[PDB]
From Swiss-Prot, chain A:
One of its GO terms (cellular component) is nucleus. One of its GO terms (biological process) is rRNA base methylation. The active site is at C269 (nucleophile). Its EC number is 2.1.1.-. S-adenosyl-L-methionine-dependent methyltransferase that specifically methylates the C(5) position of a cytosine in 25S rRNA. Required for 60S ribosomal subunit synthesis and processing. GO terms for molecular function: RNA binding; rRNA (cytosine-C5-)-methyltransferase activity. The gene is nop2. This is 25S rRNA (cytosine-C(5))-methyltransferase nop2. It catalyses: a cytidine in 25S rRNA + S-adenosyl-L-methionine = a 5-methylcytidine in 25S rRNA + S-adenosyl-L-homocysteine + H(+). S-adenosyl-L-methionine binds at S143, S144, A145, P146, G147, G148, K149, D167, D194, D212. It comes from the Eukaryota. Keywords: Methyltransferase, Nucleus, Phosphoprotein, Ribosome biogenesis, RNA-binding, S-adenosyl-L-methionine, Transferase. It is found in: Nucleus; Nucleus, Nucleolus. The chain holds residues 189 to 545 of 608 of the full protein.
UniProtKB/Swiss-Prot annotation, chain B:
This is 60S ribosome subunit biogenesis protein nip7. Signal peptide: none annotated. Keywords: Cytoplasm, Nucleus, Ribosome biogenesis, RNA-binding. Required for proper 27S pre-rRNA processing and 60S ribosome subunit assembly. It is found in: Cytoplasm; Nucleus, Nucleolus. Belongs to the NIP7 family. GO terms for molecular function: RNA binding. Residues 94-170 form the PUA domain. GO terms for biological process: assembly of large subunit precursor of preribosome; ribosomal large subunit biogenesis. CDD domains: Nip7_N_euk, PUA_Nip7-like. Interacts with pre-ribosome complex. It comes from Schizosaccharomyces pombe (strain 972 / ATCC 24843). InterPro entries: NIP7_N (IPR040598), Nip7_N_euk (IPR055359), PUA (IPR002478), PUA-like_sf (IPR015947), PUA_sf (IPR036974), Ribosomal_synth_fac_NIP7 (IPR016686), UPF0113_PUA (IPR005155). GO terms for cellular component: cytosol; nucleolus; nucleus; preribosome; preribosome, large subunit precursor.
Curated annotation (Swiss-Prot), chain C:
S-adenosyl-L-methionine binds at G44, W46, D64, D80, D105. The active site is at K145. Component of the nucleolar and nucleoplasmic pre-60S ribosomal particle. Belongs to the class I-like SAM-binding methyltransferase superfamily. RNA methyltransferase RlmE family. SPB1 subfamily. The chain holds residues 14 to 179 of 802 of the full protein. This is AdoMet-dependent rRNA methyltransferase spb1. Required for proper assembly of pre-ribosomal particles during the biogenesis of the 60S ribosomal subunit. It is found in: Nucleus, Nucleolus.
UniProtKB/Swiss-Prot annotation, chain D:
This is Nucleolar complex-associated protein 3. Belongs to the CBF/MAK21 family. May be required for synthesis of 60S ribosomal subunits and the transport of pre-ribosomes from the nucleoplasm to the cytoplasm. It is found in: Nucleus, Nucleolus.
Amino acid sequence: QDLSQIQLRIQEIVRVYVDQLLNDICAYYGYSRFLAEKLFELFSVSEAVEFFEANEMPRPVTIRTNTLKTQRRELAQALINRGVNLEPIGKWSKVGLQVFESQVPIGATPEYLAGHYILQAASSFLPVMALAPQPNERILDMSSAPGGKVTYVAALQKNTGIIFANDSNKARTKALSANIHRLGVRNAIVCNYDGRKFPNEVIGGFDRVLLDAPCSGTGVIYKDQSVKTNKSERDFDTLSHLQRQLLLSAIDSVNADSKTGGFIVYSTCSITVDEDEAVIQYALKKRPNVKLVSTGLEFGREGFTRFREKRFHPSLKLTRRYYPHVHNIDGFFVAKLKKIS
Amino acid sequence: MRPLTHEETKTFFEKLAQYIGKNITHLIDRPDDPHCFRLQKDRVYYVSERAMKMATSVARQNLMSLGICFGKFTKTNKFRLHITALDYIAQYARYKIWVKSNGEMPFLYGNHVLKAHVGRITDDTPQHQGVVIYSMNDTPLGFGVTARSTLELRRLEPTAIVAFHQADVGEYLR
Amino acid sequence: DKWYKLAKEQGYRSRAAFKLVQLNQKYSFLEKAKVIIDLCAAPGGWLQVASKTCKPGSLIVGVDLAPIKPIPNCHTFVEDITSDKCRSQLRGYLKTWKADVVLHDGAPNVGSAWLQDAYGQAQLVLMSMKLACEFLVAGGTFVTKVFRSRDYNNLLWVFKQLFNKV
Amino acid sequence: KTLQLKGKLIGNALEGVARLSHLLNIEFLGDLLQVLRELVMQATREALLTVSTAFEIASAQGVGKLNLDLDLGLFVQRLYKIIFPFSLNPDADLNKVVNATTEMEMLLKCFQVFFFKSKNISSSRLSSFSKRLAIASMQLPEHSASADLALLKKLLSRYSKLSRLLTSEEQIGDGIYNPFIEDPDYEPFLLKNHYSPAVSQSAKELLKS
RNA sequence: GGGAA
RNA sequence: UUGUCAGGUGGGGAGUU
């Protein structure tokens, strides 16, 4: 069928049928039926159409300036002198710069080589802000790769404290170590061990915990369109189980007696309800000593308390959810938990 | 992770010395933070005491990186194989030379600093001396061995060669 | 020659680009050129130098009859330099801003009398100088290429009355 | 012999040593700083003379050609540490030794010869030195306070974070390091409130400039 | 050879 | 603080092939 005809049929179905709209969306966007049905169930019919349309639009390029090396104003001046159009990424982040046009390559610039700015998604910047690492504190990162979050955490800590970053894949670990060395992080220790065993087999008692658990890629459809058709129910269940295990290990490793506070920040790159809300509910039930706390983000949709037959705890609303159609950034879910004992 | 024995320490403590000279003293001792040298595989790692204390837990084979590398221990027992120490070498640098905008790109690609492309000098630079390369924005660039001296460099042919590239900031992503 | 070789080595399209950058170095009109209008911009050497010299986000417009390869943050208008339609387009992009510096590279073809080619360039300079005064702001700059001739003295005279400095 | 006895005439002895050092042999120049640096165990005043004369000896023309080295950094850190006791003890000019008197005069004199050194400073080391200079500027007459702030005012370096949060304060530390900050954002705020009214306007002229 | 740049 | 248990690291040291 013609693409214009399919789009017109989808618009007519949205205006008014559900099966026809899903078939038209699958024909046009090429997404799998299961993924399209889950997205249609999660968001409104108009919201799902907007999310599907926004999934095709390429996200703007975002670069995080290393406060450890150069200031934001100096980086902007250097980018301007290099013939690259950059603007601040909203008001929530004071270092995030969005690049619209760049005559020279962004990653090959002298400042980029020097580590002044590192290319990273704006959503990744939010998890660092939610974690809010403090100087002279022990921060444990469950997923070191690609190192952007670790570099931001070290910059926030002003090269103080100890940042223990773990990466499961050796190939990704080597790149993360290279990025950390380029960024000049001095107190970062990179390990290659399982996150579940990390609380008990390697070390525990981290003052702060940042668990960027791997996601199905629902919010990273534009980056990796293969996940649209490679998503399976069994894979989603396995990812949810792995995320729950990682969250439990992070809670166990977090020291509630730490003077800086046992804060654990869990981040996911998918807007799936069963991946974000269910994992948070499972973690809360498994660890009564962990209580949800405000993420402190000025933007982001509140966590859903009731989705279809599934009902979440009232504290689940504190979670921050971002969507490409809502926040103009890659879909992500952020949850902050504080340990009491 | 393996503690460094005496021979490899004296084998690398001169290697620092052609670049930072006797400036290594602020590195090897610092009362605020007993942040000493550590060795994993053949890569010499400059880390804090707490870094070792956490690193004691992680396995030697598992732990691939720790703090800042100063270079691998080759068979001839020499370094510069990594430039990750550029920030420390630049700060404690005895001798720094500035390379103009024409000379930043051939250095950033690893070609040696041309005479016409030399911007500024320390004015007292011996032959075959370990020096540090800077840009106009006072930013470290890499390590270079200079076989030229200010005394004769002040009157030289542009296309001549002054400082040989050893490592550059481009290698971080190259 | 040597200048052609450096044009190929650096990526500059033609030696006339090196001519423009030297003028900017010796006069600094392009550095302060918030709005630059490029008459006879083909093949694009003048446009590239104007884009590089001017601070990014400037009002860069290059109009020439020959097609010009696209350049970021630059409007390549493939029309006559002084056409009524292109003049509408230049003022359409000009809006509240006003033309600050204008570059002109009018080049008639060779193969006829030198006096014909000299006057062909001079008239095209004057007739392009017409659009300048139409679009130029007070204190503006007009850099144009001219062929020396007997009418060159007259052209300088018109330049002296219509501009403060030559 | 006068230095060995460690009497009250050490002032004139260092005066002569600095004046006549360039007349002596090169080999003696290297060993001249050893006697200056061996007296570290009016103690602050004497240490000021040793570091100032060490700067003067190294200030001799052509030391670049005669690469005697000798690592005067030990004197540099001595001056870096000696400012705090100078700020602690009182000083009075009354009214109507390197080269002059009035101890505050050498300090600025050592600072200005330090500034006069060709590219030896302003490599992020001057700012660390200047921070404690502002800290030591909490007392002493305003004309002295204005003088040291004027040194960085006329400084060729464009660094502006000296009077605020600054890079790592290494070399004996004992101060806020603030490592890896790089923020163009303390002492002048409290300096505004001070006995002499003109210190307030001096602080105002600094922040406006 | 002159005049002008 | 001081002791107890469990875990990690461990060609550092000791012992087996």
